[PDB]
Amino acid sequence: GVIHPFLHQNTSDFMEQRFSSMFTGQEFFLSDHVIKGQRVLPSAAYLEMARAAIQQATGGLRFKNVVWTQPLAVGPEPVQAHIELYPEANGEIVFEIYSDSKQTTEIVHSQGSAVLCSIPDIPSFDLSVLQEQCSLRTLSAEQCYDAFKKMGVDYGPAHRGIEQILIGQEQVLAKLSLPSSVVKTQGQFGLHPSLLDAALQSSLGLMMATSDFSLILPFALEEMVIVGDCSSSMWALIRYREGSKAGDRVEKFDIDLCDENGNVQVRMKGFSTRKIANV
Amino acid sequence: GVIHPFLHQNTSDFMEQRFSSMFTGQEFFLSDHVIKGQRVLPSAAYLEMARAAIQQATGGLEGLRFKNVVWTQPLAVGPEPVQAHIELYPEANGEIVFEIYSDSKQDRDQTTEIVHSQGSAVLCSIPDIPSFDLSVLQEQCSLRTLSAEQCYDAFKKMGVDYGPAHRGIEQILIGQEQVLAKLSLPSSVVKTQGQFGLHPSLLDAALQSSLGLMSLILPFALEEMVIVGDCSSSMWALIRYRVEKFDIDLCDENGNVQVRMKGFSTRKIANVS
Ligand SMILES: [Mg+2]
Ligand SMILES: [Mg+2]
Structure with a gap:
C-alpha cells in the first residue's frame, strides 16, 4: 500500500x-x-x-x-x-x-x-475579541466560492472548507471545517490539504475588502511553525504584515490556524503573493 | 508491487x-x-x-x-x-x-x-577468466556418476527436502578433490529466470553439489565471490576441494565462468551413522 x-x-x-x-x-x-x-x-x-x-x-x-x-x-x-x-x-x-x-x-x-526546533509557547487567542474586531462584513461560503468561480477557480466538495469569513480592517477571521466528503481521511494527514488550503483560500477576504476582483496566489512563505495537531473545525486569522496593503505588487500576510478555543496549532508568517488575473 | x-x-x-x-x-x-x-x-x-x-x-x-x-x-x-x-x-x-x-x-x-x-x-572490474573445456573436466571427473534421483534421495535421508523448484541438479560427475555438476533451472521456475541475477534455484543447486565431495552446518562463510555474467537455464558447477574450504565456478554451457566463488567454509559436525 x-x-x-x-x-x-x-x-x-x-x-x-x-x-x-x-x-x-x-x-x-x-x-x-x-x-x-x-x-x-x-x-x-x-x-x-x-x-x-x-x-x-x-x-x-x-x-x-x-x-x-x-x-x-x-x-x-x-x-x-x-x-x-x-x-x-x-x-x-x-x-x-x-x-x-x-x-x-x-x-x-x-x-x-x-x-x-522546540515548540514556542504562543498564548491562546480570545476568539470572541477577534470576532468583534472582524465585524465590517460577513461572507458566506456561497459568496466565497461564487467569487472563486468567477476568478476561474473551481473548488469541489473536498476543497470547500470555508464556512464563513468575518472581515475586519487589514485582517479577516475565517471559520473552517473539514468537508464531510473527506472526513474519512482526517487521520491520514497531519496538515490536512482541505483545512490548510481553506486557510489559504480565506485570504480572499483581504481582497474582498477591496471588492475589485483579482486572483492573488502565493509564491513564497517565510516561516511555518507546527505547534500542535489540527482539528476538524478550526479558525484562520489572516493579517497583513505591517507595511503591506491590498493592491501591492507583492502582498504579504500571516495566517494563524487556531482550534475552537483559540489555541494556535499552526503559525504561518510571511506569505508573499502576486496578482495573476484581474476580474 | x-x-x-x-x-x-x-x-x-x-x-x-x-x-x-x-x-x-x-x-x-x-x-x-x-x-x-x-x-x-x-x-x-x-x-x-x-x-x-x-x-x-x-x-x-x-x-x-x-x-x-x-x-x-x-x-x-x-x-x-x-x-x-x-x-x-x-x-x-x-x-x-x-x-x-x-x-x-x-x-x-x-x-x-x-x-x-x-x-x-x-x-570492481570484470576479470578475464579463461573458459573451461567441459570435455576435459568431464574426463577428469570420471570416477563415478550420481543421478538426480540419487542426490535428492540422499538429501531426503539427511532430512533435507528439496521441492521441485530446488532440484536443479541433473547429475554430478565425481573426480578426485573435485566434482562437476550439471545444473538446470527446473521448468517450474523458468518463467522467473528474469526476476533474479543470482537465481536461487541454480546457485542453491551449486551449493547442493558440494555433497558430491563425500556434515556441513552453520555458520557458513565465503572469502570471495565475483559476478562475471548472467546465469543461464543450463549451467555447470565446478567444485574443487582446496582448511575446510572449497571453490565453486558456475559456468554456462560453453564453460565460461559466470560466477566465481572462492573459499566456502562451513562448520564440521560429526556425521551420525
Ligand atoms: Mg536528486
Ligand atoms: Mg539499522
Missing part, C-alpha cells in the same frame, strides 16, 4: 533520500482543486508532503523560505512526482519537490528548508 | 539504506526448500538479496564482488510470516557493508533483530 497519500513509495538511494508518487487526478485534492480548467496540486499539499517525508526519514517542525515555482497540473496523463530531502550538518533539511516531464527533465514545483 | 522477490519495499531513512520483505513461506524458495521439517531461506538467497539491494541503492552492474560473507542463523518461516530487512552501509573506500536480519516475535519480550547474513561488497 501507500505510505501516505502524498508519499506513495520510498525510492531513496545512496545519494539522496527520496519519495515518489504517481498522481492520476482522481484523488480528492486534485479532482476537487481545479484552477483555470486544469487539476492542480494545492499549494498546501507541498507542505504536508514535506512534513510527512521528513517524519518518515527521521524514523516541533519549522519550515522556512518556502517557494512555489510551478503548478503541478495533472491532465490525461498521470504525473510522476518526487520529493528529495537533503540533511545538513546544522540540523537543517532542504527539500525539493519536482515531477518528471516527458520529452529527460525534472520540473521543479516547490523548494524549502525545515528544522526540528 | 515488490521491487524484487527478496526486496519487497524500500524503507531507507536518514540513518541507513534499508529494504524490507515479509516472507510468508508460500514462495518457491521457501516451500520447496525444507531442512529438518522447516521452510528455510536458502543461503544462496542472501547473496541475491544483497546484489539486488545494491543495484537499487546505486540507481540501477557486472563485476560486483562479495568478500568475507558469513551465514550465522537460518531464517525459518513457520505459520507466521517473518519480517526480514537488509541494511546497506557505504564506506569511503567504495566498499558496501550489508547486514540481513529479521525481527523476532519473542512473546513476553520486546522484538529483537536476528542476524542471518553479513558481508561486504565492492564494485
Whole structure:
C-alpha cells in the first residue's frame, strides 16, 4: 500500500533520500482543486508532503523560505512526482519537490528548508475579541466560492472548507471545517490539504475588502511553525504584515490556524503573493 | 508491487539504506526448500538479496564482488510470516557493508533483530577468466556418476527436502578433490529466470553439489565471490576441494565462468551413522 497519500513509495538511494508518487487526478485534492480548467496540486499539499517525508526519514517542525515555482497540473496523463530531502550538518533539511516531464527533465514545483526546533509557547487567542474586531462584513461560503468561480477557480466538495469569513480592517477571521466528503481521511494527514488550503483560500477576504476582483496566489512563505495537531473545525486569522496593503505588487500576510478555543496549532508568517488575473 | 522477490519495499531513512520483505513461506524458495521439517531461506538467497539491494541503492552492474560473507542463523518461516530487512552501509573506500536480519516475535519480550547474513561488497572490474573445456573436466571427473534421483534421495535421508523448484541438479560427475555438476533451472521456475541475477534455484543447486565431495552446518562463510555474467537455464558447477574450504565456478554451457566463488567454509559436525 501507500505510505501516505502524498508519499506513495520510498525510492531513496545512496545519494539522496527520496519519495515518489504517481498522481492520476482522481484523488480528492486534485479532482476537487481545479484552477483555470486544469487539476492542480494545492499549494498546501507541498507542505504536508514535506512534513510527512521528513517524519518518515527521521524514523516541533519549522519550515522556512518556502517557494512555489510551478503548478503541478495533472491532465490525461498521470504525473510522476518526487520529493528529495537533503540533511545538513546544522540540523537543517532542504527539500525539493519536482515531477518528471516527458520529452529527460525534472520540473521543479516547490523548494524549502525545515528544522526540528522546540515548540514556542504562543498564548491562546480570545476568539470572541477577534470576532468583534472582524465585524465590517460577513461572507458566506456561497459568496466565497461564487467569487472563486468567477476568478476561474473551481473548488469541489473536498476543497470547500470555508464556512464563513468575518472581515475586519487589514485582517479577516475565517471559520473552517473539514468537508464531510473527506472526513474519512482526517487521520491520514497531519496538515490536512482541505483545512490548510481553506486557510489559504480565506485570504480572499483581504481582497474582498477591496471588492475589485483579482486572483492573488502565493509564491513564497517565510516561516511555518507546527505547534500542535489540527482539528476538524478550526479558525484562520489572516493579517497583513505591517507595511503591506491590498493592491501591492507583492502582498504579504500571516495566517494563524487556531482550534475552537483559540489555541494556535499552526503559525504561518510571511506569505508573499502576486496578482495573476484581474476580474 | 515488490521491487524484487527478496526486496519487497524500500524503507531507507536518514540513518541507513534499508529494504524490507515479509516472507510468508508460500514462495518457491521457501516451500520447496525444507531442512529438518522447516521452510528455510536458502543461503544462496542472501547473496541475491544483497546484489539486488545494491543495484537499487546505486540507481540501477557486472563485476560486483562479495568478500568475507558469513551465514550465522537460518531464517525459518513457520505459520507466521517473518519480517526480514537488509541494511546497506557505504564506506569511503567504495566498499558496501550489508547486514540481513529479521525481527523476532519473542512473546513476553520486546522484538529483537536476528542476524542471518553479513558481508561486504565492492564494485570492481570484470576479470578475464579463461573458459573451461567441459570435455576435459568431464574426463577428469570420471570416477563415478550420481543421478538426480540419487542426490535428492540422499538429501531426503539427511532430512533435507528439496521441492521441485530446488532440484536443479541433473547429475554430478565425481573426480578426485573435485566434482562437476550439471545444473538446470527446473521448468517450474523458468518463467522467473528474469526476476533474479543470482537465481536461487541454480546457485542453491551449486551449493547442493558440494555433497558430491563425500556434515556441513552453520555458520557458513565465503572469502570471495565475483559476478562475471548472467546465469543461464543450463549451467555447470565446478567444485574443487582446496582448511575446510572449497571453490565453486558456475559456468554456462560453453564453460565460461559466470560466477566465481572462492573459499566456502562451513562448520564440521560429526556425521551420525
Ligand atoms: Mg536528486
Ligand atoms: Mg539499522
